[PDB]
């Protein structure tokens, strides 16, 4: 999945008129997501991680 571009995205669109471009049919990497020590908080609700 090309989620890295969104991860390092320079700009984000508005909440009311964000451009709709569906991206699917892939398996994500989550390689860099394993290092969560740099994030101030980490919350999960409704299911244990």
């Amino acid at each position, epitope marked *: 999945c090309p989620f890295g571009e969104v991860f390092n995205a320079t700009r984000f669109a508005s909440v009311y008129a964000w451009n709709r471009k569906r991206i699917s049919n892939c398996v994500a990497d989550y*390689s*860099v997501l*394993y*290092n*969560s*020590a*740099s*994030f*101030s*908080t*980490f*919350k*999960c609700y409704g299911v*244990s*991680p």
Partner: antibody
Amino acid sequence: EVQLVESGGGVVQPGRSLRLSCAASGFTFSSYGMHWVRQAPGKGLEWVAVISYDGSNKYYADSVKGRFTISRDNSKNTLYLQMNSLRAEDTAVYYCANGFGEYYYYAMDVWGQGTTVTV
Amino acid sequence: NFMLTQPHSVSESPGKTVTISCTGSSGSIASNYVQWYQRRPGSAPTTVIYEDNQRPSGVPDRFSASIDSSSNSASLTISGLKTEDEADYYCQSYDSSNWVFGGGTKLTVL
């Protein structure tokens, strides 16, 4: 079934060169990482460092960066931690243990027994 | 940054049901092993409970450790209180690599 014993030398003069090992086996060590935790007396648990599997990005604490250098080899499933210029504040039991689950560190189940080190 | 919420003042008569409340965050309370640390002034600190499965001789059976997910809270009741054991309870938690001290808890037993 689950027996892990730590062994090493006794009285070691500070500044000497010696290598230690805490071999982890019996499972898939390829996907399992080795973590080291130091427990300061009176205070809570202290984070030390973390290493990514890819190795592109490595993060270290400000109090351990520069002086220490770690080396690991997935082929032999053994981690080597060369201790140079031992500090007085580092005189504590060293826990050789693997993190909870797969790629999880925020959770802790079993503490480290500790290794016999003298500073 | 981190916000700690505790009651301003609360007390209950002995012999009734008491429940000390300390909110847990920065993760799942069912995934955190809550281990209490005490440092009695005038004495040298020594570990009393570690590894969550080792019992030194003389450890009382009254203390029990578990997590209750029915009401998202933990219940602990301590009997056999001793006069020299009267002190202040402080609940401490750590997130990443930051340490935050509490505002100060004062409790008086009437």
